[PDB]
Amino acid sequence: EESLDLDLERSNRQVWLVRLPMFLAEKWRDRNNLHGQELGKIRINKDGSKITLLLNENDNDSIPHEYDLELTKKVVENEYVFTEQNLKKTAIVGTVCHECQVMPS
51/65 Cα distance (integer angstroms): 13
CB atoms within 10 A of CB 34: 6
Q: Which is nearer to another protein, 36 or 61 (CB)?
A: 36
CB contact set of 70 (below 8 Å; sequence gap of 6+): 100, 101, 103
The reply on whether position 57 binds another protein by CB under 8 A is: no
Closest distance of CB 62 from another protein, Å: 18
Judged by CB, which is closer to another protein: 47, or 61?
47
Q: Which residues bind another protein (CB under 8 A)?
A: 4-6, 9-10, 15-22, 25, 28, 31-33, 36-47, 53, 75-87, 90-96, 101
